[PDB]
Amino acid sequence: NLDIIGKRIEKIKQEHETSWHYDQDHPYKTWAYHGSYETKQTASSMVNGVVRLLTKPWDIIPMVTQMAMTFKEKVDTRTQEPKEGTKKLMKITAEWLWKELGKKKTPRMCTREEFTRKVRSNAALGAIFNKWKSAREAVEDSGFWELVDKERNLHLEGKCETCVYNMMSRAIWYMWLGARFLEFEALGFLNEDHWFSRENSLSGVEGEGLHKLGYILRDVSKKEGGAMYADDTAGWDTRITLEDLKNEEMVTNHMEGEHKKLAEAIFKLTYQNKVVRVQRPTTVMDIISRRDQRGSGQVVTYGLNTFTNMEAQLIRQMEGEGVFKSIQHLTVTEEIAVKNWLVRVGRERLSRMAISGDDCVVKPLDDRFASALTALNDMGKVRKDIQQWEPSRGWNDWTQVPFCSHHFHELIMKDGRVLVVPCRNQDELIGRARISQGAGWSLRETACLGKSYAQMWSLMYFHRRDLRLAANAICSAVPSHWVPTSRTTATHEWMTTEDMLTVWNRVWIQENPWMEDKTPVESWEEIPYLGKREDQWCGSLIGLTSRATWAKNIQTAINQVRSLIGNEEYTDYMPSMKRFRR
Ligand SMILES: [Zn+2]
Ligand SMILES: [Zn+2]
Numbered sequence: 001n002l003d004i005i006g007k008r009i010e011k012i013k014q015e016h017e018t019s020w021h022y023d024q025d026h027p028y029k030t031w032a033y034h035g036s037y038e039t040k041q042t043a044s045s046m047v048n049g050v051v052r053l054l055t056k057p058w059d060i061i062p063m064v065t066q067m068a069m070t071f072k073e074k075v076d077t078r079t080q081e082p083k084e085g086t087k088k089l090m091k092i093t094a095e096w097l098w099k100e101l102g103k104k105k106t107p108r109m110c111t112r113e114e115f116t117r118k119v120r121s122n123a124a125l126g127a128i129f130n131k132w133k134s135a136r137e138a139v140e141d142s143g144f145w146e147l148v149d150k151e152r153n154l155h156l157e158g159k160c161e162t163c164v165y166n167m168m169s170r171a172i173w174y175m176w177l178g179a180r181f182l183e184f185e186a187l188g189f190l191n192e193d194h195w196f197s198r199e200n201s202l203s204g205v206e207g208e209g210l211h212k213l214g215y216i217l218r219d220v221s222k223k224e225g226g227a228m229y230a231d232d233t234a235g236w237d238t239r240i241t242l243e244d245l246k247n248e249e250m251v252t253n254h255m256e257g258e259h260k261k262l263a264e265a266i267f268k269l270t271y272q273n274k275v276v277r278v279q280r281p282t283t284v285m286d287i288i289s290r291r292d293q294r295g296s297g298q299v300v301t302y303g304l305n306t307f308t309n310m311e312a313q314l315i316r317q318m319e320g321e322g323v324f325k326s327i328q329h330l331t332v333t334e335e336i337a338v339k340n341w342l343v344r345v346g347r348e349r350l351s352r353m354a355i356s357g358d359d360c361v362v363k364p365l366d367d368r369f370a371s372a373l374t375a376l377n378d379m380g381k382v383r384k385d386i387q388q389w390e391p392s393r394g395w396n397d398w399t400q401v402p403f404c405s406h407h408f409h410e411l412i413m414k415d416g417r418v419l420v421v422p423c424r425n426q427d428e429l430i431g432r433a434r435i436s437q438g439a440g441w442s443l444r445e446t447a448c449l450g451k452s453y454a455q456m457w458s459l460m461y462f463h464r465r466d467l468r469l470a471a472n473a474i475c476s477a478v479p480s481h482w483v484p485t486s487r488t489t490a491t492h493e494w495m496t497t498e499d500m501l502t503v504w505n506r507v508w509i510q511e512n513p514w515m516e517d518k519t520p521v522e523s524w525e526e527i528p529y530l531g532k533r534e535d536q537w538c539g540s541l542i543g544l545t546s547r548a549t550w551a552k553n554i555q556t557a558i559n560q561v562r563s564l565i566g567n568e569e570y571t572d573y574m575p576s577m578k579r580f581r582r
Pocket of ligand 2: 407409423424538
């Protein structure tokens, strides 16, 4: 409590002394309340006109149109403390997992130089506006770094002054750029040096890309065992216990010098003790604290969620294999059996999983896993959309398993070679490309975002008839040499001015470890589609009157957009298709 959060609270109280008041009608039960002060202010989703003008048939599909119109009673719930047996299982497993992750890696501090480059190339670090306008301006002004140094030396002392969260199935907690830097210095190595790559972590997929995930699921499917299980958790970030935050901190045991102390401080002072400011309309600013749940930076959140999720799923596996009998209490001989399992088969059991933060696919040794629920429920990782004690429903086919919002098809080229391609309902893909976030978008910038989406569709979704055609139309409608842009930046190989057929060959043939024959593809017509009936199942409008009219008359839609943008240098990409090729 207050000897760690006090100083932070004291400092804010004073800056709004003319507004302070301990409000008695406060809507908090599970958060600790501290006081309120006067504020008044709020960002909605705008339509990309370039993409909408080249996707007319979809102007009458509600699933697409509604996406562009528009829980904080789940952040106010309290997780129970686990049993002693559960806590023992978690500490042993965490201890062992950090050793394994650390066998071929060296913890190290990230640098101002490294941080500066990040900001000067638009990564979404989640900072606030005020003294300097943007992030960019603050990074050259030596004043900033004197503030950063004040807080830094404070953290070495073991106290905090300026590290305070701002809260705006999602909940995003911005800090000021300074506190983001100090988080990056101490914990950035996890992302920057790829601790959760598949090579290093065996379960993880950090930096793999959407064109590898299908191949990774199929490799898992090849192992002997039961169904593939893919249970989603209900509000994962709100079910992170203090015991979870403590096992995460054991990464510091692998550190030394300044680093160990700086990392210890972030975990102690910001993660395991939180100070947050929230807008309430009855408008005031509420200064609340609590000890548990997740609210770090989105990139460190990712890596820590993967770590804790790896830990939970190895434990659920142990329960299915009958390594321990009850969560109430671990005997002495059970501790040695758990430790022996991890040493004998742990690495093999990690390779049976694909884990991306809160998202997992598990192919266990057999189907006992399905009704092994006691550890999972007691750790607080309650399954979404199924009764607490009802057994999990597994999948019998790797092409039906959901993972990172996709499913994966197996697709045979005319030359016999095999692609594994990502897919989702086509209304979701078209609906997202019609949306832009923010204000002050020039026509040129709107066009360049449209082009980023088209290049993505050509590289990942080439097998959907409607998306190859819409992609060709957009790349024809936007000046050939204008560079694809994005304001909120996995592997993004479509962000480039290089020839898209040359990128396709590098990604799917040259650099693809699942493809033995390296024979380049000479044109887009060598590159196959899903079956027509499969394309309709995944949402294609192939076979409708509206869709045939759009395709027939596509050069008229292309010319409409060219007339609005003006007299520039354009390329016709539509003769790359068979039906437009004379
Ligand atoms: Zn601090
Ligand atoms: Zn599909």
